[PDB]
Short mmCIF file of C-alpha atoms (C1' of nucleotides) and ligand atoms in Angstrom, two decimals:
data_model
loop_
_atom_site.label_atom_id
_atom_site.label_comp_id
_atom_site.label_asym_id
_atom_site.label_seq_id
_atom_site.Cartn_x
_atom_site.Cartn_y
_atom_site.Cartn_z
CA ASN A 1 0.01 -0.14 0.06
CA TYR A 2 0.91 3.80 0.43
CA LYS A 3 1.31 5.66 3.50
CA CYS A 4 1.86 9.15 4.55
CA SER A 5 5.39 10.66 5.23
CA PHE A 6 3.92 13.54 7.17
CA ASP A 7 5.22 13.93 10.69
CA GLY A 8 2.23 12.57 12.69
CA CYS A 9 -0.21 11.33 9.98
CA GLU A 10 0.08 7.69 9.66
CA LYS A 11 -2.57 7.55 6.95
CA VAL A 12 -2.68 4.88 4.29
CA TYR A 13 -4.12 4.48 0.94
CA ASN A 14 -4.68 1.81 -1.70
CA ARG A 15 -3.65 3.83 -4.62
CA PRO A 16 -0.80 6.32 -5.64
CA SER A 17 -3.23 8.87 -6.62
CA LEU A 18 -5.32 8.72 -3.20
CA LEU A 19 -1.99 9.21 -1.56
CA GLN A 20 -0.81 12.48 -3.65
CA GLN A 21 -4.34 14.04 -3.16
CA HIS A 22 -4.20 13.64 0.53
CA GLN A 23 -0.58 14.86 0.48
CA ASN A 24 -1.73 18.07 -1.20
CA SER A 25 -3.86 18.78 1.68
CA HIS A 26 -0.60 19.12 4.09
CA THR A 27 0.98 21.35 1.11
CA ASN A 28 -2.26 23.34 0.74
CA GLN A 29 -1.94 22.65 -3.15
CA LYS A 30 -4.92 22.46 -5.38
CA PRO A 31 -3.71 21.16 -8.74
CA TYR A 32 -7.21 21.12 -10.42
CA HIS A 33 -8.08 24.67 -11.55
CA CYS A 34 -11.50 25.95 -12.68
CA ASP A 35 -11.33 26.82 -16.35
CA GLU A 36 -14.17 29.37 -16.06
CA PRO A 37 -13.56 33.13 -16.78
CA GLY A 38 -13.47 35.21 -13.42
CA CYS A 39 -13.38 32.12 -11.12
CA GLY A 40 -10.00 30.79 -10.47
CA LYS A 41 -10.94 28.53 -7.77
CA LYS A 42 -8.66 25.68 -7.23
CA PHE A 43 -9.23 22.27 -5.90
CA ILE A 44 -7.48 19.06 -4.42
CA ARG A 45 -9.38 16.47 -6.18
CA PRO A 46 -11.23 16.01 -9.42
CA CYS A 47 -14.64 15.39 -7.98
CA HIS A 48 -14.67 18.61 -6.07
CA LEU A 49 -13.91 20.52 -9.45
CA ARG A 50 -16.33 18.35 -11.46
CA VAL A 51 -19.05 19.63 -8.83
CA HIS A 52 -17.61 23.14 -8.41
CA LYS A 53 -18.11 23.60 -12.15
CA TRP A 54 -21.88 23.30 -11.70
CA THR A 55 -22.06 26.75 -9.89
CA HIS A 56 -21.54 28.12 -13.45
CA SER A 57 -24.09 26.43 -15.67
CA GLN A 58 -27.07 28.76 -15.73
CA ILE A 59 -29.68 25.71 -15.34
CA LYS A 60 -28.50 23.71 -12.09
CA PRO A 61 -29.04 19.70 -13.06
CA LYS A 62 -31.24 18.59 -10.24
CA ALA A 63 -34.68 19.99 -9.97
CA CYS A 64 -37.65 20.35 -7.46
CA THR A 65 -40.83 19.08 -8.49
CA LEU A 66 -42.64 21.76 -6.19
CA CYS A 67 -40.93 25.22 -6.34
CA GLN A 68 -38.95 24.91 -9.64
CA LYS A 69 -35.67 25.79 -7.64
CA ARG A 70 -32.88 24.13 -8.99
CA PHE A 71 -29.92 22.47 -7.23
CA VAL A 72 -26.35 20.94 -7.60
CA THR A 73 -25.98 18.06 -5.10
CA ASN A 74 -28.50 15.47 -4.13
CA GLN A 75 -28.18 16.66 -0.49
CA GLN A 76 -28.98 20.30 -1.51
CA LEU A 77 -32.50 18.80 -2.97
CA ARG A 78 -33.11 16.47 -0.13
CA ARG A 79 -32.77 19.29 2.46
CA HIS A 80 -34.82 21.60 0.76
CA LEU A 81 -37.70 19.18 0.18
CA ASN A 82 -37.23 18.48 4.14
CA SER A 83 -37.69 22.18 4.62
CA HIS A 84 -41.05 22.03 2.47
CA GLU A 85 -42.25 19.16 4.26
CA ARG A 86 -41.35 20.67 7.72
CA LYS A 87 -43.27 23.82 6.24
CA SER A 88 -46.11 21.76 5.45
CA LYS A 89 -46.44 20.56 8.81
CA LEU A 90 -46.48 23.86 10.33
CA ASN B 1 -13.43 21.63 18.91
CA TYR B 2 -9.76 21.11 19.24
CA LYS B 3 -7.46 21.59 15.99
CA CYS B 4 -3.70 20.87 15.44
CA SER B 5 -1.77 24.14 15.25
CA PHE B 6 1.08 22.27 13.57
CA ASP B 7 1.87 23.35 10.05
CA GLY B 8 -0.12 21.57 7.43
CA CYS B 9 -1.49 19.14 9.97
CA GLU B 10 -5.10 20.00 9.79
CA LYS B 11 -6.14 17.12 12.32
CA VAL B 12 -9.33 17.97 14.81
CA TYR B 13 -10.00 16.08 17.86
CA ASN B 14 -13.11 16.62 20.22
CA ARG B 15 -11.24 16.29 23.54
CA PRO B 16 -8.07 17.88 24.87
CA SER B 17 -6.36 14.58 25.69
CA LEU B 18 -6.93 13.55 22.11
CA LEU B 19 -5.37 16.61 20.50
CA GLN B 20 -2.34 16.10 23.18
CA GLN B 21 -1.76 12.74 22.30
CA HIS B 22 -1.64 13.48 18.62
CA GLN B 23 0.67 16.45 19.54
CA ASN B 24 3.05 13.78 20.92
CA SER B 25 3.56 12.74 17.49
CA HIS B 26 5.03 15.86 16.28
CA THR B 27 7.31 16.15 19.41
CA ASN B 28 8.13 12.47 19.39
CA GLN B 29 7.32 12.24 23.04
CA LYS B 30 6.23 9.11 24.81
CA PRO B 31 5.06 10.14 28.26
CA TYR B 32 3.50 6.98 29.45
CA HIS B 33 6.38 4.73 30.82
CA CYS B 34 6.08 1.06 31.98
CA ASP B 35 6.86 0.81 35.78
CA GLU B 36 8.15 -2.78 35.46
CA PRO B 37 11.56 -3.80 36.41
CA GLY B 38 13.67 -3.99 33.23
CA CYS B 39 10.90 -3.08 30.93
CA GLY B 40 11.42 1.08 30.51
CA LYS B 41 9.24 0.90 27.61
CA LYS B 42 7.45 4.14 26.86
CA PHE B 43 4.23 5.09 24.97
CA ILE B 44 2.14 7.96 23.32
CA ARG B 45 -0.98 6.84 24.81
CA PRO B 46 -2.34 5.49 28.00
CA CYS B 47 -4.23 2.65 26.14
CA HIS B 48 -1.12 1.38 24.45
CA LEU B 49 0.45 1.14 28.09
CA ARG B 50 -2.68 -0.47 29.70
CA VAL B 51 -2.36 -3.04 26.80
CA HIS B 52 1.53 -3.47 26.91
CA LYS B 53 1.36 -3.88 30.70
CA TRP B 54 -0.45 -7.53 30.25
CA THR B 55 2.76 -8.90 28.71
CA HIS B 56 3.97 -8.75 32.47
CA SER B 57 1.14 -10.27 34.07
CA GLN B 58 0.99 -13.70 34.84
CA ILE B 59 -2.46 -14.52 33.57
CA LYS B 60 -3.10 -13.06 30.08
CA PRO B 61 -6.92 -12.01 29.48
CA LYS B 62 -8.09 -13.60 26.33
CA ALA B 63 -8.02 -17.45 26.31
CA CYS B 64 -8.52 -20.51 23.87
CA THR B 65 -11.35 -22.38 24.39
CA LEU B 66 -9.33 -25.31 22.81
CA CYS B 67 -5.71 -25.21 23.77
CA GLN B 68 -6.07 -23.04 26.89
CA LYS B 69 -3.34 -20.71 25.44
CA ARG B 70 -3.95 -17.21 26.55
CA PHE B 71 -3.88 -13.73 24.78
CA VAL B 72 -3.90 -10.18 24.97
CA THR B 73 -5.78 -8.59 22.26
CA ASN B 74 -8.95 -9.83 20.86
CA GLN B 75 -7.35 -9.81 17.59
CA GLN B 76 -4.73 -12.31 18.70
CA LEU B 77 -7.36 -14.62 19.79
CA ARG B 78 -9.31 -14.17 16.61
CA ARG B 79 -6.57 -15.05 14.43
CA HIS B 80 -5.28 -17.95 16.50
CA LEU B 81 -8.79 -19.55 16.41
CA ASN B 82 -8.97 -19.08 12.66
CA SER B 83 -5.56 -20.95 12.52
CA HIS B 84 -7.27 -23.73 14.46
CA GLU B 85 -10.28 -24.03 11.96
CA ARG B 86 -7.86 -23.73 8.74
CA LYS B 87 -5.86 -26.70 10.11
CA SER B 88 -8.95 -28.69 11.48
CA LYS B 89 -10.79 -28.20 8.19
CA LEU B 90 -7.82 -29.25 6.01
CA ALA B 91 -6.98 -32.55 7.90
CA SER B 92 -10.93 -33.04 7.87
CA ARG B 93 -10.88 -32.70 4.02
CA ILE B 94 -7.99 -35.20 3.89
"C1'" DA C 1 -48.81 46.96 14.71
"C1'" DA C 2 -43.96 48.64 11.51
"C1'" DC C 3 -40.37 48.07 14.05
"C1'" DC C 4 -36.09 46.23 14.82
"C1'" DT C 5 -32.85 42.39 16.68
"C1'" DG C 6 -30.37 38.20 17.28
"C1'" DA C 7 -31.62 33.41 16.74
"C1'" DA C 8 -33.01 30.02 13.71
"C1'" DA C 9 -33.47 27.64 9.20
"C1'" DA C 10 -32.43 27.49 4.74
"C1'" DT C 11 -29.16 27.67 1.04
"C1'" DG C 12 -24.72 27.08 -1.07
"C1'" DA C 13 -20.25 25.51 -1.68
"C1'" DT C 14 -16.55 22.32 -0.75
"C1'" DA C 15 -13.90 19.11 2.10
"C1'" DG C 16 -12.90 13.51 2.71
"C1'" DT C 17 -14.36 8.60 2.21
"C1'" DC C 18 -16.33 4.58 -0.41
"C1'" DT C 19 -17.91 1.85 -4.43
"C1'" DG C 20 -17.66 -0.01 -8.84
"C1'" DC C 21 -16.32 0.25 -13.77
"C1'" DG C 22 -13.07 -0.39 -17.41
"C1'" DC C 23 -8.55 -0.03 -19.44
"C1'" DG C 24 -4.37 -1.53 -20.31
"C1'" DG C 25 -0.14 -4.21 -18.38
"C1'" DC C 26 1.46 -8.41 -16.74
"C1'" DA C 27 1.79 -13.72 -16.54
"C1'" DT D 1 -6.48 -15.77 -25.75
"C1'" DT D 2 -6.77 -15.61 -20.96
"C1'" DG D 3 -8.05 -13.95 -16.49
"C1'" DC D 4 -5.65 -11.06 -12.53
"C1'" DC D 5 -4.05 -7.01 -11.12
"C1'" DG D 6 -2.83 -1.97 -10.31
"C1'" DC D 7 -4.63 1.87 -11.35
"C1'" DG D 8 -7.17 6.21 -12.31
"C1'" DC D 9 -11.65 7.57 -13.16
"C1'" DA D 10 -16.81 9.00 -12.34
"C1'" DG D 11 -20.49 9.28 -9.03
"C1'" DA D 12 -22.49 8.89 -4.64
"C1'" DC D 13 -22.61 9.88 0.28
"C1'" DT D 14 -21.65 12.49 4.82
"C1'" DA D 15 -19.96 16.56 7.14
"C1'" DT D 16 -18.58 20.99 7.59
"C1'" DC D 17 -18.94 25.96 7.50
"C1'" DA D 18 -20.10 30.40 5.22
"C1'" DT D 19 -23.61 33.10 3.25
"C1'" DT D 20 -28.92 34.26 2.94
"C1'" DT D 21 -33.11 34.16 4.04
"C1'" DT D 22 -36.44 33.37 7.32
"C1'" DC D 23 -38.74 33.70 11.94
"C1'" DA D 24 -39.81 34.76 16.34
"C1'" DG D 25 -39.17 38.01 20.24
"C1'" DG D 26 -39.63 42.09 22.22
"C1'" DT D 27 -40.55 47.30 21.46
"C1'" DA E 1 15.58 -40.88 4.63
"C1'" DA E 2 16.17 -37.03 7.22
"C1'" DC E 3 18.38 -33.22 5.43
"C1'" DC E 4 18.61 -28.54 5.31
"C1'" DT E 5 16.67 -24.03 3.62
"C1'" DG E 6 13.81 -20.46 2.52
"C1'" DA E 7 8.59 -19.49 2.12
"C1'" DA E 8 4.43 -19.41 4.79
"C1'" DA E 9 2.14 -18.93 8.53
"C1'" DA E 10 1.70 -18.29 13.34
"C1'" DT E 11 2.44 -15.13 16.93
"C1'" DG E 12 3.36 -10.87 19.25
"C1'" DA E 13 3.63 -5.91 19.98
"C1'" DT E 14 2.01 -1.47 18.94
"C1'" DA E 15 0.42 2.60 16.42
"C1'" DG E 16 -4.40 5.34 15.16
"C1'" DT E 17 -9.58 5.31 15.62
"C1'" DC E 18 -14.51 4.68 17.11
"C1'" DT E 19 -18.07 4.21 20.70
"C1'" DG E 20 -20.16 4.30 24.80
"C1'" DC E 21 -19.92 4.77 29.93
"C1'" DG E 22 -19.74 7.18 33.74
"C1'" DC E 23 -17.98 10.98 36.29
"C1'" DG E 24 -17.83 15.66 37.61
"C1'" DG E 25 -19.31 20.48 37.17
"C1'" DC E 26 -22.68 23.71 36.89
"C1'" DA E 27 -27.01 26.21 35.68
"C1'" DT F 1 -32.84 16.68 41.88
"C1'" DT F 2 -33.13 17.69 36.66
"C1'" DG F 3 -31.09 17.21 32.85
"C1'" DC F 4 -26.80 19.53 29.60
"C1'" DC F 5 -22.28 19.87 28.84
"C1'" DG F 6 -17.26 18.40 28.73
"C1'" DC F 7 -14.35 15.04 29.80
"C1'" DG F 8 -11.14 10.97 30.44
"C1'" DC F 9 -11.35 5.89 30.57
"C1'" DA F 10 -12.07 1.08 28.74
"C1'" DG F 11 -13.39 -1.84 25.48
"C1'" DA F 12 -13.00 -2.76 20.88
"C1'" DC F 13 -11.58 -2.36 16.33
"C1'" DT F 14 -8.12 -2.18 11.94
"C1'" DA F 15 -3.82 -2.07 10.37
"C1'" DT F 16 1.22 -2.58 10.22
"C1'" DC F 17 5.72 -4.73 11.14
"C1'" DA F 18 9.01 -7.91 14.05
"C1'" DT F 19 9.78 -12.07 15.89
"C1'" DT F 20 8.87 -17.46 15.84
"C1'" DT F 21 7.38 -21.35 14.47
"C1'" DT F 22 5.69 -24.24 10.96
"C1'" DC F 23 5.62 -26.37 6.58
"C1'" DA F 24 6.71 -27.88 1.92
"C1'" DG F 25 10.77 -27.79 -1.85
"C1'" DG F 26 14.40 -30.04 -3.66
"C1'" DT F 27 18.30 -32.91 -2.24
ZN1 ZN G 101 -0.97 12.90 5.87
ZN1 ZN G 102 -15.41 28.20 -11.41
ZN1 ZN G 103 -38.95 23.51 -3.72
ZN1 ZN G 104 -0.72 17.85 14.02
ZN1 ZN G 105 6.56 -3.24 30.19
ZN1 ZN G 106 -6.01 -22.66 20.65
#
DNA sequence: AACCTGAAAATGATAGTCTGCGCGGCA
DNA sequence: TTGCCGCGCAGACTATCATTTTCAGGT
DNA sequence: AACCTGAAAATGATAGTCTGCGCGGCA
DNA sequence: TTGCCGCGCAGACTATCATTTTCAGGT
């Protein structure tokens, strides 16, 4: 496997990529750049950037059947629907 | 909560003791010493020493139902019983 | 009331971890 | 031709925290 | 064969992390 | 007495590596 050389970490990952992404956390390195005009945000991991890029699309992917609002994560949508339900109850 | 001030660490623990024990990693400190004649081993955490002290005690805690041998960790005993099972099965197939 | 005010909830963005896939390399 | 393995990839989750919006209390 | 010999397995010790408990301090 | 909150401990775990013992290979 692959272990972290950091002073007191002692973490282990089963892939080189995972170790490099973990180590970028100690070195505050964010290889994955948003190629979007005006953003210049950077991220440790490719998933983080794949998700960030949705903030720029005019129409966000996940939709609310009720209020037509749109969202990015599933968790965003579920939290929003639980707010709708808690609101109905009141 | 409790965060590590060390550069680029970014660990977090929910108790002072936990933070202090992590910080023993940076300072290479082993506060908890074995008070046993001739041992003089040292440890980062109190649990590590609580576990070590069993090596000196006359009766180890975990026992084997089969061969009566005794052990320290549960993992030790689980592994030993799986050795018993592998051997019993292999000779039973034979 | 029509106010404010800070608390409470919603919303938004982003960090780590886990699963399962395909794809090349190896034997 | 094989599968067998190491590996990166893509997407999911939870958790965290900041930023906004709502909300209730007192005034 | 009964050898050795190195591989594989057993065994032992020790690092970090997670959960649940009781325990004291308060308000 | 309520709990509510911090807090350290104990038990449990995973994982790693060192040290011993077992076990087949060729001889
Ligand atoms: Zn690390
Ligand atoms: Zn961007
Ligand atoms: Zn909605
Ligand atoms: Zn640290
Ligand atoms: Zn000792
Ligand atoms: Zn036994």
